[PDB]
Amino acid sequence: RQFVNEWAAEIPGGPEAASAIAEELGYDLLGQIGSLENHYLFKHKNHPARSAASAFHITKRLSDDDRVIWAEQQYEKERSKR
Amino acid sequence: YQEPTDPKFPQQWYLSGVTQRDLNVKAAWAQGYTGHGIVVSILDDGIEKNHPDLAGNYDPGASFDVNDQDPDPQPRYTQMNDNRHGTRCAGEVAAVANNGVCGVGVAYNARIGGVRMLDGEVTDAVEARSLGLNPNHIHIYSASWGPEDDGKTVDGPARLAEEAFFRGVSQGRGGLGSIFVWASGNGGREHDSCNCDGYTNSIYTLSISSATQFGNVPWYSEACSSTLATTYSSGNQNEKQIVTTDLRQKCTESHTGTSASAPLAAGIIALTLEANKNLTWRDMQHLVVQTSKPAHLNANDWATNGVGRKVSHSYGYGLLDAGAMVALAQNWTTVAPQRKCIIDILTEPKDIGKRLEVRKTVTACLGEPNHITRLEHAQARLTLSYNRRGDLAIHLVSPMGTRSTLLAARPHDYSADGFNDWAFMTTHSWDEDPSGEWVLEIENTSEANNYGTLTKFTLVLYGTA
Ligand SMILES: [Ca+2]
Ligand SMILES: [Ca+2]
Ligand SMILES: [Ca+2]
Ligand code: NA
Ligand code: NA
């Protein structure tokens, strides 16, 4: 399993909060995730793009933030055509 | 009205046949429904938008490239034509009619788009962005893909995808709900069970299985209780296959698998939406249940449920019937708002051993706002430990006696991970009365000495009052 340096998070404060979170925690804000309002995708500025290891302490900092309902590190899923 | 003149239309046996072994689509066209005003999008490896049989119906408002982050879902051309799949699916839905090219789509006057999202790294975010694209413009999303069909895998939508599904059905289409059409899987050779696939197993997706031309269960077919209905696809080498648009502006007569069945269903559903544009996402599933035809499908497990409908784990409620779908839709009364009754069955963990039976009488949330007297979907959310998962078979019996196989033996699944609040879904008790005794059966189908414990059994009932 390959984890990627992308994190998703639900942020009720909206895009201004998402922007603050990105600069304070060391992310580039990529934007809202599709039509899910208050869900945003981030890319960490220093963490490697692909790794077999999860980045547990990065995730904890993001989800522990009082502006974040939840967060998860993205990873590459095995999906097949049928 | 004149039936299509396209050169390969006669070879589309599943659309028009002399022998009554078809999807009764002609009768829908003759009633005047061709998909006009309906927008469908194929979530796959891209769509050849300039294909001669797609260009006239192509809709950039229903398309996007999630893999490369651009608006153009054009497939990536390779020597081996790896990215032909979404173009083949798009043609089944909305290939242009009466233009001298290849054949026709089921909804040949619909607008068709593509989300390029499989030709790259697929993450939870990728899936959610695809499932939630332009949900007030796209009406129907067709997806053939899912977790590996190896017979070992248990996987479903993660949190973002799960949220996109729910926001889709609750807020999409101006509140009537996005219609997600899904293929049930190709793991038949591995004895895979499509209830172990959380995309097909979801209540938010209209899950479609396949039948061969001669009316049999294809080799690649997966059985499970979450499948809703069936459309034709490939089989043995004497049976014909699906005729559609192919990459590099070509025409194929060899599109196969359940990926060919789901787009045909999305087309039929597009015709049905044209017949009644106010149908909700649950309205559409009700229509499929009532109008699907078991008659021409051969199965070893046809069973009559509590409201008198035949249901199979290979076929759901049988073959889609487009003419009956559009006919029933026109004066259909929108169903009551969805209710959800959550019932905790266990007071303590139960040893499984060789066999476990859990019986429980329920009131289906009597005296509460989510009281249900007419069932739609039903789930058994199970949490259990076990040393050898694939040796388990799990059944759920409703008060009216309908036996749903939630999980069949999977000879290749040697996992010791058990199930972690995994929601096994059945459609087989649709419209039944939910109150009374439900029975859960868990058995070790093997002679080997296996062991485990069921720690949690949440019965979740969806429906109306
Ligand atoms: Ca592109
Ligand atoms: Ca054509
Ligand atoms: Ca499967
Ligand atoms: Na927090
Ligand atoms: Na489903």
Author numbering:
A (entry chain B): 29 to 110
B (entry chain A): 110 to 574
Sentences from the study reporting this entry:
The complementary triple mutant (77)A-R-S-A-A (M2) was also resistant to proteolysis by furin but revealed more potent inhibition compared to M1 (Ki = 0.32 ± 0.03 nM). Indeed, we could obtain crystals of M5:furin and M2:furin at pH 5.9 and pH 7.0, respectively. The structures of M2:furin and M5:furin were refined to 2.0 Å and 2.4 Å resolution, respectively. Four and three copies of the PC1/3-prodomain:furin complexes were observed in the asymmetric unit for M2:furin and M5:furin, respectively. In both complex structures, the globular part of the prodomain is bound to the western rim of the substrate binding pocket. The C-terminal residues 104-110 extend over all non-primed substrate binding pockets of furin (S1-S6). The main difference between M2:furin and M5:furin is found for the secondary cleavage site loop between Lys73 and Ala83. This region was well structured in M2:furin at pH 7.0, but no electron density was observed in M5:furin at pH 5.9. Apparently, the secondary cleavage site loop adopts a specific conformation at pH 7.0 but gets unstructured at pH 5.9. In the isolated structure of M2 and in the complex structure with furin, we found an unusual interaction of the His72 side chain with the amide nitrogen atoms of Asn74 and His75.
